[PDB]
Specification:
Layout (H helix, E strand, L loop, with lengths): L7 E4 L2 E6 H4 L16 H6 L10 E11 L2 H8 L4 E3 L2 E5 L9 E5 L8 H14 L13 H8 L6 E6 L5 H13 L8 H8 L6 H5 L2 H8 L14 E9 L2 E11 L2 E9 L8 H15 L4 E7 L4 H4 L7 E4 L4 E4 H4 L11 E3 L22 E3 L1 H5 L5 H13 L34 H10 L10 E4 L4 E4 L8 H19 L2 E4 L1
Parallel strand pairs: 1-18, 10-11, 16-18
Antiparallel strand pairs: 1-3, 2-3, 3-5, 4-5, 6-11, 6-12, 7-8, 8-9, 9-10, 12-13, 14-15, 16-17
The protein binds zinc ion.
Zinc ion (ZN) binds next to loops.
GO molecular function: arginyl-tRNA--protein transferase activity; metal ion binding
Organism: Kluyveromyces lactis (strain ATCC 8585 / CBS 2359 / DSM 70799 / NBRC 1267 / NRRL Y-1140 / WM37)
InterPro entries: Acyl_CoA_acyltransferase, N-end_Aminoacyl_Trfase, N-end_Aminoacyl_Trfase_C, N-end_Aminoacyl_Trfase_N
């Protein structure tokens, strides 16, 4: 039989759209008029008639029952995040807020005065007066790794991501402190921050794996640690849990899921300290990146991540661009779509699976050429839908000329045009080139009618509902990832 440790096990995709007032927790549907639209072209399209547009908050994704760390690493780098076991992203074209995937590391990090102050006070809180610093440290990372292990009052401990009452009670206090009373029940805390879709080896590990990880301050250059998957890092002050960091270990680095701290410890600045400690952790274990999740330029609860610097995923081009290079042109909630200035004006969405962009050469934001009210994407996708109907895909054309909800619901229907999803024109190419038949003998279905797995053998002969579900999965994660998928229908 089959090796489930190389499988991505997922539900069928969902496209969930609703009024941003109240579904969006970043803007609650309240946008200044200069930030309401994804591009100048769309603001012009509604110039002076902005009321009729009712901002939507929109996500697309799937639940997973199993994903290994390498596959989760690929999803992160496709623009997804996990919320518990649900893998999701926003519809960057229609969403109220423009969410960008961001990663950084110690090479990008500019140690500002604000950040150095947070470390000096952290050191002063945990360090004995007998501690003797070196006259110089190469890096702030080497300074941290000298004094932190020597504190007799402060201990950070990595451990499996398991519920405890103590962790939950701290969570309740913090969520109340930040006024995030999302019912915060025990079950919800467990699902959000303890239960994960990773393998049992990745969740539970071994005693030696945790021991090696917890010795991270002592790693020397070129040394590596075996840990992948989820972890809790517990911060103790004289035995008292004062903070909890929920972290995913990936081959390419560390992803920060959530961070909580005891509100009575406001003057330890634990929010800044923990991100710096994690940036140091990434460096010490010799991995390239620290992932803070989603960056929203106009939302204070998320734009703090810019202080750690780094680069932003261009989902359309599947490449990162340094935030410093584009910060100026996304500070009004714009969708950015890169295009080298030398390249001709494109008459289509950018091709994913096929002259890749180079952000060191000059480039411009081509969002209105492709996805604007007069862009090519919509017509290109309408023609593509008709071509795909001939293969049995149950897509329908999006004939409303505007992408926004105007003021005078099938959760399995994805819009024809979503940035970062495989363009329907490219899906047509997969069918026409025969590439779709590589799904045969590779993609697997879990059939809940029969409570049984089966390997797809002749994909094009499957029922239209099944071919449609699989094709939407391909839109989301690409053909090669879908080939190792088990999809629950
Ligand atoms: Zn919003």
């Amino acid at each position: 039989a089959m090796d489930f440790t190389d499988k991505l096990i997922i539900s069928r995709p969902l496209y969930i759209s609703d009024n941003a007032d109240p579904k969006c927790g970043y803007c609650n549907g309240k946008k200044d008029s200069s930030h309401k639209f994804a591009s100048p072209g769309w603001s012009d399209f509604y110039k002076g008639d902005e009321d009729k547009v009712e901002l939507q908050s929109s996500t697309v994704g799937f639940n997973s029952e199993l994903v290994n760390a390498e596959t989760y690493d690929k999803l992160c780098n496709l623009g997804f995040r996990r919320s518990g076991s649900f893998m999701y992203k926003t519809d960057m074209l229609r969403n109220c807020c423009r969410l960008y995937t961001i990663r950084t590391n110690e090479k990008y990090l500019t140690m500002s005065k604000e950040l150095k102050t947070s470390l000096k006070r952290f050191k002063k809180k945990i360090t004995s007066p007998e501690f003797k610093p070196q006259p110089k440290y190469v890096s702030w990372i080497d300074e941290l790794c000298d004094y932190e292990p020597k504190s007799t009052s402060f201990k950070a401990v990595f451990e499996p991501a398991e519920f405890t009452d103590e962790k939950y009670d701290l969570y309740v206090r913090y969520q109340h402190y930040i006024h995030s009373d999302e019912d915060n029940t025990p079950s919800q805390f467990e699902s959000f921050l303890c239960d994960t879709p990773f393998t049992d080896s990745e969740i539970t590990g071994t005693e030696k794996e945790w021991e090696q990880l917890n010795n991270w301050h002592n790693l020397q250059p070129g040394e590596r640690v075996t840990k992948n998957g989820p972890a809790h890092e517990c911060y103790y002050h004289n035995g008292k849990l004062i903070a909890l960091s929920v972290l995913d270990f990936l081959p390419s680095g560390v992803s920060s899921v959530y961070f909580i701290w005891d509100p009575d410890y406001y003057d330890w600045s634990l929010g800044k300290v923990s991100a710096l400690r994690e940036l140091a952790l990434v460096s010490k274990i010799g991995r390239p990146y620290y992932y803070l999740g989603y960056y929203i330029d106009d939302c204070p609860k998320m734009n703090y991540k810019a202080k750690f610097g780094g680069e932003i995923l261009d989902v359309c081009n599947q490449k990162y661009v340094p935030l410093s290079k584009i910060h100026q042109i996304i500070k009004h909630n714009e969708l950015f779509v890169g295009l080298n200035s030398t390249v001709a004006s494109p008459d289509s969405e950018i091709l994913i699976t096929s002259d890749k962009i180079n952000f060191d050469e000059p480039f411009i934001n081509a969002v209105d050429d492709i996805y604007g009210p007069n862009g090519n994407a919509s017509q290109n996708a309408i023609t593509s839908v008709a071509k795909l109907r001939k293969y049995g895909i149950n897509y329908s054309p999006d004939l409303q000329r505007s992408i926004y909800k105007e003021i005078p619901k099938d959760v399995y229907r994805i819009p024809n045009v979503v940035p970062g999803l495989v363009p329907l024109m490219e899906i047509v190419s997969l069918f026409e080139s025969g590439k779709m038949n590589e799904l045969n003998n590779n993609v697997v279905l879990f059939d809940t009618k029969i409570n049984a797995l089966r390997i797809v053998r002749d994909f094009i002969s499957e029922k239209p509902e099944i071919k449609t579900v699989i094709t939407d999965v391909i839109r989301l994660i690409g053909l090669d990832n879908t080939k190792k998928a088990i999809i629950i229908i």
